[PDB]
């Protein structure tokens, strides 16, 4: 997207979201990142929304095909599952590449750095969902390491109700439950996160209260399923 203005890429990413054209949205936001400037809060969210939609569709398709393949056990189901899997891995590698070149290293404020490290954990987690064997082990450790660094920063630099801090804890708890085979760690993290946020709600405006309690309900929803 080298010939398009940064501001035009951002404007077109917003239009693509409205049109539910998420592959386009991700390509526009990749082009915007590759302009080399840091991203604002709104721009980071556009980048994340675009890729979460793209990879979310791929993950849903991979799960459908993997279920059919498991029930079957010609080569067609495996071949097509592998094709979708390779595409999914390519998108994850693209996002991880943007984070490594050079979003994370230039992110000095806690809000941006935690945001990008949470993304890094998420996309390694999506790689882990389809990985098999010892490659899975190193991918899992990469997700854990990214989430842990984000957690350490968020606990030092953000209030317990901050929505990015809450969403990070939610997703790290899912990592523990679904990827790392650590359901007790998942439950403990979700419970502690919820309780510390509850005790801080009194400091918030009406609008911030709505933002934080929406994510707290997601933590509670997981706790209800897990206990």
């Amino acid at each position: 997207m080298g010939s398009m203005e940064r501001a035009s890429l951002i404007q077109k990413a917003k239009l693509a979201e409205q049109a539910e054209r998420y592959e386009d949205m991700a390509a526009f936001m990749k082009g915007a990142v590759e302009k080399g400037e840091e991203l604002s809060c709104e721009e980071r969210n556009l980048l994340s929304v675009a890729y979460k939609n793209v990879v979310g569709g791929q993950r849903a398709a991979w799960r459908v095909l993997s279920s059919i393949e498991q029930k079957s056990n010609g080569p067609e189901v495996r071949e097509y599952r592998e094709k979708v899997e390779t595409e999914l891995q390519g998108v994850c590698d693209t996002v991880l590449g943007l984070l490594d070149s050079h979003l994370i290293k230039e992110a000095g404020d806690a809000e941006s750095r935690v945001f990008y490290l949470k993304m890094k954990g998420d996309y390694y987690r999506y790689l882990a969902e389809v990985a098999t064997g010892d490659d899975k082990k190193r991918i899992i450790d990469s997700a854990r390491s990214a989430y842990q660094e984000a957690m350490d920063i968020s606990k030092k630099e953000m209030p317990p109700t901050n929505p990015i801090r809450l969403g990070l804890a939610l997703n790290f708890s899912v990592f523990h439950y679904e990827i790392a085979n650590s359901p007790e760690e998942a439950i403990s993290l979700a419970k502690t996160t919820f309780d510390e946020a509850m005790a801080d709600l009194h400091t918030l405006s009406e609008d911030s209260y709505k933002d934080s309690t929406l994510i707290m309900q997601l933590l509670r929803d997981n706790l209800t399923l897990w206990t």
């Binding site: 969210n45 997703n171 899912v174």
Partner: peptide, 9 residues
Amino acid sequence: AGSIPGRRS
């Protein structure tokens, strides 16, 4: 188990 939906700005 649900992660952040994260699919709408």
